[PDB]
What does this fold into?
Amino acid sequence: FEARQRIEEKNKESSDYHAKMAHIVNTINKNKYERERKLRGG
Amino acid sequence: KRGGVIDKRF
Amino acid sequence: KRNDVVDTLSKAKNITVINQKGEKKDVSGKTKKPDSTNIKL
Amino acid sequence: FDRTAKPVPVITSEVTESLEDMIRRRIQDSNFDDLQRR
Amino acid sequence: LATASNGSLKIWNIKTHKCIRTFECGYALTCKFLPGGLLVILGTRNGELQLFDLASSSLLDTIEDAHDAAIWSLDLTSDGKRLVTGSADKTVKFWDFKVLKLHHDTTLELTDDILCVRVSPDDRYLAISLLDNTVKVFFLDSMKFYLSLYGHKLPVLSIDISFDSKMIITSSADKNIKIWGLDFGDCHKSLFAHQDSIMNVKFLPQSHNFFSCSKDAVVKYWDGEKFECIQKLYAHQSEVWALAVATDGGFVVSSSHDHSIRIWEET
Amino acid sequence: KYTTFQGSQNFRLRIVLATLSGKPIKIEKIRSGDLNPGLKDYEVSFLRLIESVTNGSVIEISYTGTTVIYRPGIIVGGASTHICPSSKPVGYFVEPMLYLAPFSKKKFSILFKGITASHNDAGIEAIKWGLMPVMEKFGVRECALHTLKRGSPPLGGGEVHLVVDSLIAQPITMHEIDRPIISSITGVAYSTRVSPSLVNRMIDGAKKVLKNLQCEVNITADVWRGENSGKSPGWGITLVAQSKQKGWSYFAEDIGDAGSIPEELGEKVACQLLEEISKSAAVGRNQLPLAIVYMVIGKEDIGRLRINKEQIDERFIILLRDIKKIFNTEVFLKPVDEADNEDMIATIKGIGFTNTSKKI
Amino acid sequence: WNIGKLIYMDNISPEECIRRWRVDLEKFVPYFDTFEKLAKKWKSVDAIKERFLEYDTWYELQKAKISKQLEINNIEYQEMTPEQRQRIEGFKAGSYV
It folds into this structure.
């Protein structure tokens, strides 16, 4: 059981690290409540 | 996780 | 493929055809057409 | 410690329910990956 | 039991099933007894209000110009002193019973034709069904607009407000019965009830169960808390126009296009 | 030892101020004489929330529940979910978190679940358009409250997400010694699980009272229907008077009950917005507590805030006394030199507070 | 009755302070008058009509911002009484204590 939980977490930090790295390389080189409009209708 | 709420209520 | 176009038009109900005269007709070829007394009685 | 290989998966009810949802959608659309005569 | 048709108003004895009195009237569209069971008020299709007395066996009062069009509905307050009439001239008028003649009190002009008016048992609300598919709820005491109920594809033909003034049921020509919460006007449940226009819907007194009749010749008995059909009652051969429930809830009366008045007794 | 307080009065404020000052406090005699003495379920829920957003805090509740000993830790923040008991809406819990979010080790990303509206606590729109703009004036650039689901009382079912991406060392020093000019009036009229026409009728009443004003009035209709509309029907309105010149705002809000007319509620909130404006100098009475605290925790400099004579009421006085007990800071009030009004400038010296939880 | 002093006299209740010069924060919504009274009060929009309508380097700009704040501090403190000033700022550097 702990083997599956270990694999699931390591995939989580690794994906977070890569996304965080992509943001840094992106930066180095408007509306915030827009989604609420869609949620009203259902 | 350090510290916490210690609830002693009956 | 034109026949495949025709049957699709006939199959759908929210289709109105306008002839050269400007009068409104259905795909079949018949003119496309509440009252308080009618619903109550 | 680390493990060398992928753990063998465990078939829980959620895995079944998701799998049968794939199967039911495929039958609904008649989307089958089956051999056909040439 | 009073039964009003085009050309005659006949009053029956529910026990002997025999007609006691017959009056000649116009194209009657709605009738109600006054308290005491000694008078009946009709709204005919010409706009006339006709008031009869059973003991005298004659027409006491007629108001030819009560409305410019058909008086489609007619309701009394619980006290029996005020009468509300809606017409196809797009107005609701209020009348007073004074010693016994009718006097016009007030008029409320609506946007569209009126099909049903119902006053709550507590005399607190007035619900009016309009030809534009909406039911408007008013405060009877002040005549302040309170709510409008939306959701029917076709006009609402009948209304009924529960004994505690909490739910309101509406039935339309689109074959649905909608049960609304009268606190906010939200639809608790929408039932696809009959196979044709649902003409009448009546709460059983002191309960949330209700009856319905339709043009499909079936009378259905429903559950107000579970929204399930208890019993389907197949007796009529044609449209069931009218429906009535006894004050004790002991029996229900339905009249149909097939000239038969059927009394359904609780067993 | 401990700074001792009495009763349930200002429970959230005292806990918040102790957290910012780091000074241990004791609140005793909480509802001693009541039939149900001690802490309520929502006040215990608020103490659980403080535990989750800090580290190393010790919260001891007495055996009888009439005394709370709080030893604050460091503000850490992070991602979490909080289930608000039905006795209080989310706004009762989001509002104190606005005092702590900017000064955290990690970002606050808290998901609040429960009822999203009430008669006595802050609504979603009051926080979004009434309090959160004030935080922006004080240097909190990035802060937002996302509505995922609306939940009206009594059943609720709402869901709001507070994200405060800006972590700042301390608020800037405020210098607002004028009466801002109102440029326009906006607002949100909302409903859940009910027909749109209630919101329209809310607006018709509100436009009716405000049309005599010379400024534009634009109220939004927020009609929620379907899955994200909660479990109960409800409607309300929140009108905001905005001053685009310096980003100041004044707001009033209320919700409808069972058996109420939407037009009357719209007129009531429209009248209350005018009442609030007349009683205000630079911030409204419902924004004043946040402004005063943020001025206290600035640099060792004199901030100035103009306040109307109407805003000095019993709530203002108890707020200042609590600040002096925790922070030893005294607010000095001086008259404005003008004769048109009787306003005063509230001058506060900041304590030189600093966000020491953030890594450098 | 200087309300500035009355606020910090803990002997005087906050209710008592207001009347001489003239409840709780858990209730966010502030107190308002009754709707009908407010309706009559605001039948007209009068009494509120008044409310309704270069440095060479970046270093010099930042230095200017700081010096304006220190200039504000001095102006406020001089207006205050010396007893009032000690209560607010405290004992400034150079004081022999």
User: Anything to note?
Assistant: Chain E has no helices and 26 strands. Chains E and A do not touch (no CB pair under 8 Å). The longest strand of chain E covers residues 101-109.
